[PDB]
């Protein structure tokens, strides 16, 4: 399965603000939904809880039926291995080429040398960075660095895709192309959860609309 | 080799190649801090050989009874050589003692006019190193006295005790100095590897976020620390050998003045391999301790 | 203090307090690398004093004619004392020379059978300590022979050069060790500051982009480098003080055996200030060289 | 004056692509214009040339009547001091509090202690981060980290404002608030040049619009 379930999840940072309060929702496998909210609502915190980067202060979290509320540090790397994550700051390896950045998840999975070459180039083609493979991340524009993170998150055909403003940069023409890339992955059966501020992109689709406000979640059309 | 081992080694080697001058400075610092104890140890090894081989250590100087002749004195010498704490005994007759008496005085009027030789037979005893202790030499001189035909042990126990105190002081000081140089090697290698990783702690966080295990992350850093310790130790072996050649002329000159020929001995092949192997382990452990501290820092809870 | 000085000092000081253990390790590395030559300088200083004060260095011997008496010998002694390069002159009479002969022999009591003393008057002249050059001693000895009433001027010759050769060898080895210890101090302090600044090179880039001058950027790093040298040097003074006390007891037993009293001389107040001032300058220059490299790296062209 | 003038400017990175080909335009003091183009068109490169960060391979650049095409490294700090620059990566000092990040332009200029406290707090109020003064930049969301850089660029009442996508993060409601903030400075007489991808934001205004396409500049309504 690839489902996600939240039951009264609440997260409070160490000595800081209360990021979330009583978040309760569940997502069927293969379902695509949008996450929205004002700046500082807690969209990135919600995505981090699912991936396991942060642990909730209350409530329980289920990933594919497994309880990941309190996971041992040994078991965490085998949870994030099934999740395609895109960050806000693009979290790149500045001392490695574009090819090395995209190929690292495959190496962790221990793929063969020939298969790495074919799959990496195919991923870079989907975002239009094929000729940038030999470059370093410092020699790329703001939108080009962002598209490297997207390519890295889709090489390993993950079960769940978590996107944190994947089109903050990039023009509207290129942003729609990136959205269509997630569409075809969803048709295969990948669960996609996207957080964004682009009103125009959302208005052109009809997916589930998860609205987050001051750490409180609204299910949209319904909590079902 | 394993495929991931090959990947880790290439990644570790690429970092050092990326910034040449900075890597060279780190290797140079380690090399100098390792040349210092290597040279001093080489001095200690060579000085110990010369002292054991060339120092005229105090002699027992056994005095025999004047009534005994050469044949009876030789029997006493044989009894001396049969003792547990005796390595070798050399015999000098009464006339031999008279010959040394003439050499020191330079005038024959103190020995020739006597009706008989007033000097007793002298036996030179070579004591064993383990039996050259304070209590052992004291015990040895008693057993020598108990041996028939011996009436005096000319050994003074004053110069022997005075020389013993200086040896104890030099060993005490060298031990404290040696600890500081060894302790400096651990800190210099440990701090250099610790600071090198800290500049790259961002790559540790990025790899951990995409699901890499701790073993996967550690290997490129572990091989980097071992290479740094190995490269620094290897360079010092070149420096130590060069400094021998600078001192080769000086030592030969001193040996020429004394007449006796002496040659300096450098580090053996076994010591060279041990130095490389130990320095690599220090870098390996330092890299393991530094990286594990970062992996715990990025843990959410 | 100026407002720019206080802000730069406060910013530099806050960086050290941010990560205590990492700063502590860097200070400990510098402290050990400075204690090593601090103790070795103290060992050299005390040994040099003790050898000058206590070692019976070989001397110059003058033999007078057998026909002279003590009164005539004293006139020769007076001539010896007035010569340039002479520290003091000691005199031994004919009976004194025979008395020392009797004391060494023990069995030399038969000398009383002689009608007259065969040993001539012996005079001892100590050359000036700074005038003990090989050519100077021969020149002094030859000039001494011109004095009336001298039968022979005697020098140990071989023992003079042999002792001088060994001392010269100690000088070359000690100088070789001293350079290595000094070089290690320069490299350890320089490399520790260089790696510390490299981890903060991103903050240099940010300030350049917003219009900060090179002088403004340098100041927090210059004060941080000087503090590391000052903190490390200050700590090594405590370690040197502690290690003296450990060796202070040991020297007492050595002095007790010889009976004569000797005391360990530590580092004077002037030496302590010089060590603190020099190490602060090294950190200042090291922090200046490292920072200028990054400033030149971030310029367009 | 606060005018900017380009004359056949062309930039080509070391061993890389020719970012700009013969850009030529000028801006009168006190006018506000938008900079738009597809990803990789060279928008950030154009802004870096004005700031003196990059030196053009050809042509001349005039800033307030002063030729800066071959400025010596000594005079550069006195040029960037007159420019309020908002970067794409927010270029923050991660080891200093939010208050210290916004106050560093004033310290360089050398303002008094009391004046710094009043001006910094006023700037953080304009972006809504007043209560975030004592936090560190790692303790802020992507939207709040972005707004810290905006506040840093407006404390020193700069003559020219260069914005590199100042609303990549932030919701639509907060994006309008930032845009109104720039318009307030423009009424005083500050020249504003902002590069953005938000076509929706531009549609609600009628300012001069500059299109950059594959390194070739188009003046929009006119090159005047
Ligand atoms: C890498 C550097 C290693 C340096 C090693 C130094 C070895 C010294 C070899 C030259 C002298 C040997 C011949 C002397 C013996 C002889 O002639 O023969 C032995 C003589 C007496 O015999 P004779 O009366 O027949 O001449 O002994 C002496 O004259 C005095 C004893 C000399 C013993 C010296 C041993 C210690 C020297 C330490 C110097 C180095 C100190 C380094 C700083 C800590
Ligand atoms: C920081 C720690 C430094 C320690 C330095 C200690 C210096 C020696 C202190 C004790 C010396 C007492 C000797 C008294 C001599 C006497 O009374 O008597 C002096 C006698 C002769 O006079 P007498 O017949 O009257 O006794 O001389 C001797 O017997 C031999 C000469 C001894 C001179 C030794 C000087 C060098 C010692 C170096 C040891 C340290 C080496 C450190 C490693 C390189
Ligand atoms: N590491 C952190 N430590 C403490 N508080 C944090 C941390 N990260 C975020 N916060 C706080 O948690 C709240 C929500 O932050 P979060 O990053 O989840 O927001 P977001 O919805 O992604 O917002 P944005 O669109 O501005 O990026 C804010 O009050 C923020 O200051
Ligand atoms: N430091 C650099 N070194 C080399 N090439 C660079 C560098 N920075 C940018 N480039 C290249 O120059 C071109 C323009 O980059 P620039 O950053 O100016 O784009 P941009 O218009 O800001 O784009 P985006 O919408 O991605 O932010 C691109 O081809 C980019 O890869």
From Swiss-Prot, chains A, D:
Please indicate if the UniProt record lists Protease as a keyword.
no
Main localization of the protein described in the UniProt heading: membrane
Biological process GO terms, please?
cell division; division septum assembly; FtsZ-dependent cytokinesis; peptidoglycan turnover; positive regulation of cell division; response to antibiotic; transmembrane transport
Mutant lacking the gene: phenotype: Inactivation results in a filamented cellular morphology, but not in a temperature-sensitive phenotype.
Q: Which domain of life is it from?
A: Bacteria
Q: Which SUPFAM superfamilies match?
A: P-loop containing nucleoside triphosphate hydrolases (SSF52540)
Its job:
Part of the ABC transporter FtsEX involved in cellular division. Important for assembly or stability of the septal ring.
Subunit info? Homodimer. Forms a membrane-associated complex with FtsX. Interacts with FtsZ, independently of FtsX, FtsA or ZipA.
Mind telling me what this protein is named?
Cell division ATP-binding protein FtsE
Lineage runs: Bacteria, Pseudomonadati, Pseudomonadota, Gammaproteobacteria, Enterobacterales
UniProtKB/Swiss-Prot annotation, chains B, C:
Q: Which Pfam families match?
A: FtsX, FtsX_ECD
Bilayer-crossing residues are 24-44, 173-193, 225-245, 272-292
Q: Which InterPro entries match?
A: ABC3_permease_C, FtsX, FtsX_ECD, FtsX_proteobact
Which keywords does UniProt give here?
A: Cell cycle, Cell division, Cell inner membrane, Cell membrane, Membrane, Transmembrane, Transmembrane helix
Q: Which residues lie on this side of the membrane: Cytoplasmic?
A: 194-224, 293-301
A GO BP entry:
FtsZ-dependent cytokinesis
- Highest taxon of source: Bacteria
Query: What GO CC annotations are associated with the protein?
Result: ATPase complex; cell division site; division septum; divisome complex; Gram-negative-bacterium-type cell wall; membrane; plasma membrane; plasma membrane protein complex
Give the way it sits in the membrane. Multi-pass membrane protein
Q: Where in the cell is it found?
A: Cell inner membrane
Periplasmic compartment: which residues? 45-172, 246-271
- Predominantly, its location class is membrane
What outcome is recorded for mutants in which this gene has been deleted?
Double deletion mutant FtsEX grows well on plates with LB medium with 1% NaCl forming healthy colonies at 30 degrees Celsius, whereas at 37 or 42 degrees Celsius, the colonies are very tiny and sick. In culture medium it exhibits mild elongation of cells at 30 degrees Celsius, and become very extensive at higher temperatures. This double mutant does not grow on LB culture medium without NaCl (LBON) at any temperature, possibly due to excessive lethal filamentation.
Q: Please describe the quaternary structure of this protein.
A: Forms a membrane-associated complex with FtsE.
Q: What does this protein do?
A: Part of the ABC transporter FtsEX involved in cellular division. Important for assembly or stability of the septal ring. Encoded in an operon consisting of genes ftsY, ftsE and ftsX.
Q: Which PANTHER family match?
A: CELL DIVISION PROTEIN FTSX
- What NCBIfam families does the annotation carry? FtsX_Gneg
**Record-stated family:** Belongs to the ABC-4 integral membrane protein family. FtsX subfamily.
Any additional notes?
Answer: Overexpression leads to strong inhibition of growth, cell filamentation and eventually cell death.
Name listed for the protein in its UniProt record: Cell division protein FtsX
Q: Which organism is this protein's natural source?
A: Escherichia coli (strain K12)
Q: Which gene encodes it?
A: ftsX
